[PDB]
Design a protein around this ligand. Sequence first.
Ligand SMILES: Nc1ncnc2c1ncn2[C@@H]1O[C@H](COP(=O)(O)OP(=O)(O)OP(=O)(O)O)[C@@H](O)[C@H]1O
Ligand SMILES: Nc1ncnc2c1ncn2[C@@H]1O[C@H](COP(=O)(O)OP(=O)(O)O)[C@@H](O)[C@H]1O
Lengths: 381, 381
Amino acid sequence: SRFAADPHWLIYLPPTMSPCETSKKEGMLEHPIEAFEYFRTRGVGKVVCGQKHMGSRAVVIVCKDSQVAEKRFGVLDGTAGICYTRTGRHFFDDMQLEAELIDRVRKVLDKSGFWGDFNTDWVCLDCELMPWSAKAQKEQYSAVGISGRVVLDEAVKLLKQASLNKTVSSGKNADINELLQRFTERSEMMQKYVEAYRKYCWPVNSIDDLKLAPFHILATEGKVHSDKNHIWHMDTIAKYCTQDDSLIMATNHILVDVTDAESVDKGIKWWEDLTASGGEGMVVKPYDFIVKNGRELLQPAVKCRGREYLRIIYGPEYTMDENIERLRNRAVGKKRSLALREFSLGMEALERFVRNEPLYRVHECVFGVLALESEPVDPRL
Amino acid sequence: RHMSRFAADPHWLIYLPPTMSPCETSKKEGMLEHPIEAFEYFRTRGVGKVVCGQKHMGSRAVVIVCKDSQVAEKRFGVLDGTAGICYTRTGRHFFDDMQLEAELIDRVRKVLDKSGFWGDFNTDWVCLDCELMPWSAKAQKLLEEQYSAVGISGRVVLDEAVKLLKQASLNKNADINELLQRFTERSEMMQKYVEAYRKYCWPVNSIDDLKLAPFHILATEGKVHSDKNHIWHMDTIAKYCTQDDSLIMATNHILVDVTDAESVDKGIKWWEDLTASGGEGMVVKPYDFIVKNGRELLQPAVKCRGREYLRIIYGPEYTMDENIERLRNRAVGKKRSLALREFSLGMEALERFVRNEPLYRVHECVFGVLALESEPVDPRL
Ligand SMILES: Nc1ncnc2c1ncn2[C@@H]1O[C@H](COP(=O)(O)OP(=O)(O)OP(=O)(O)O)[C@@H](O)[C@H]1O
Ligand SMILES: Nc1ncnc2c1ncn2[C@@H]1O[C@H](COP(=O)(O)OP(=O)(O)O)[C@@H](O)[C@H]1O
C-alpha cells in the first residue's frame, strides 16, 4: 500500500528476466530455438522449461509461529509470515487474507514434515500468485466526472506555463513532452496487459479463489539452496507443498537436451501447445541454479513468450524492420547484464541473512536490486 | 486534427472555438494586465462600446442539443443514437461517462422546451458556446467562490506542477520507504499530479457538481448568428436558458463606453473588486459579434486577467522586477494572428454546416483550428 512491508521481512527481491534474441522466423519475435541456442552455445547441455503461470511475482516467507518471526527476523508484528511483492510491498491490503494464505502453506508444510527434514522453522519461497487481477493496479478512460484526457490536457497546459518560470536554472527544451509520452505509453501498455490477461483472470471472493505456484526454495535456516538444480526445486516443492491443498500448484515443466534435435523438437511442440490460445509462454533455465561459462555468468532464466501474447503486447498491426530488430537485440543486451547484477545482489542478500549478518548489510543488496529496477527499460520485454 | 481525441461521433464536430489573446501589457507598476489596455485596443479601432464578462474558473464547452435522437441522425447524420454532445476546445468529449453527458444535454433540452426556444427559432437543434464550471453542491455556490472565501487559489495546483518539474529533473542509513519514494516511476509522478489537478479543479461526481454558462447562440437551423451583437446573445440566452433549471447560469457582465472616462472608471473598478475577491479576471468583447475596421478584423475578444491570478500563470515573483519584460508584446502578436485565423475557420465551419455542405468540408475548417492550436506559442498568453 502506501508503505512497504516491515523491512525486517525483506531479505530478498527477485531479479528481472531477459527475453531471447529476435527470431529470424517470419512473423515471430521470440521462439524457443533462440532460448535453447543461447544455452547450447555456452556449454549447457540440459535446460528446464517451466510453464509461465500468468499471475504476479510473489516472495513468500513462512515461520512455524510468531515467536520464530520475532526472534529470527526481528518482526515485532505478531505475524508468522508474509507474502510480498516485487517492490517490497504486501501483496494484499487485507492482512487477514495474507495470514490465511500463510496458514494454508504452513499446514501443508506441517503434514509433509518439511520443517524436520530441512532442520528449519522458516522458509523463503519464490512464487507466482494467481490470478493476475488479484494484485493492485488501476485508469483514465472511464473517469467518474470530467474525462481523464481532458483533465490531463488541462494539467499539462499548466505544467508548460510553470516551466517558463525562473526557479531552477539547463537550457534544453522542456522534457514535458517526453514526460507526457512515458505517461500515455504507460497507459496504452497497461491497456494491452489487461487484454492479454483478461482471459486468465477471475474475481477473488476468498482465499479459495487464489493459486500459489512456488518455483524456488530460496532459503531455509542456515542454507541458501542456490546449489540445487531446478529439478530438485520443482520436485521438492511438489513433494512438500502440492500434495494436500489445491491452493498450492505444481508447475508443468519439461527437461530439454539442447544438443538433441529430437529433445529440442519436443520442447518446441510443448511451447507451441502452451501458447496456442495466447498463453504467455515459458521460462527456460539452465539445469543448475548457477552456471558459469568460463568466468562469464550465464542467465539464470530466459523467458520465451507466445506469438498470440506478444501480438497483444506489441499490437496486432505491428511490424519489425531492420534497425528496429537491431534496437530490440541491443535492448535485450541491456536487460541481460541488468538481470545478472540483480540476480547476484539477491543471492548475496539471502547469503548475508543466512550467515546472520546485520540487517543493513542484507538491505545493501536487497535495495540494490530495487535501485536497478528503477532504470528505464522496454516494458514489452 | 485527430479523432482518437474526440472519441465521439464525428458528425457532431461542426465547430471549435478560437484561442483568445490577452491585452497589451499595462504601463502601470506591478501590473502586467489592466483593463485600460483592453479598452484602448477597441477605442483606437472604432469600437465605441464593449461588453465585459466575468471570467470564471472552468473550461470552454461546445454544447449541441437536438430535440431527439431522430433529428440528430437526420440533420447531423449522427449514427450512435445520441441526441446531443458536450465537447472541449480540443474537440474531446467532456465526460468519459456517456450517461453523465446525456443528463447534461437533457437538462438543457428541458430548459429550451419550457421557454419555447425551438418554436421561436424554428429549429430542432442548436449549437451553443459556453463555459462549464465546477459547482459546490453542498454550499450551493461556485467552487471558485468557496475557495476564494478562505484565501485558497490555484497556487495549490501550481505548487504541485512545480514539485513534478523538480522531481522529474532529478536522478541509520537506508530507509525502504524513502527509497520507494525516490525510485517513484516517472509515469507515477505524472499520475499523482493529474489527480491533484482533478481534485482542485474538477471534483465532480455528478451533474449536481457542475454549472453551464452559455454566452453565444452560434447556430440554429438555417442561420449562424454572427450577425447579432453580444447583448442579443446575452438577452436571448437569459430568456430561453436562464429562467428555470439551475444548471444553466447567467454570466455576470457589464457594459463600457470606451470613449467615456466615467464609464471606464466604473469598469476598471468592476474588474478590481472582481479580481480582488480572487476572480480570474474578465473577457472584453466588442459590442458586435464581428467588427472589421478598415478591412482589418478586430479581435473577437480580449482577456484581462487579475494581478493575483497572474502569479499562478507567470510565477509568484513575476511582479517585482521581471515585470519589465513585458517585452512580450510581440508574443501577444503571434497569439493575435492565430486568434483571428481560428475565429474565421470556426464561423466558416458553421456556415458550411448551415448550408448543408458535406461533412468533410465542415471538418476541413474544424481541423484547421486544431492545426493552428498546434503551432508553438507562449502558453501563458
Ligand atoms: N463570458 C465569456 N466570453 C468568452 N469567453 C469566456 C467568458 N467567460 C469565460 N470565458 C473563458 O476564457 C477562455 C480563454 O482564456 P483562458 O486562457 O483562461 O482559457 P484556457 O485555459 O485556454 O482554456 P478554456 O478555453 O478551456 O477556458 C474562453 O475559452 C472561455 O472558457
Ligand atoms: N516457472 C517459472 N520460473 C521463473 N519465473 C516465472 C515462472 N513462471 C512465471 N514467472 C514470472 O515471469 C516473470 C517475468 O515477467 P515480466 O512480466 O517479463 O517481468 P520483468 O521485465 O521484470 O522480467 C518473472 O518476474 C516471474 O514473476
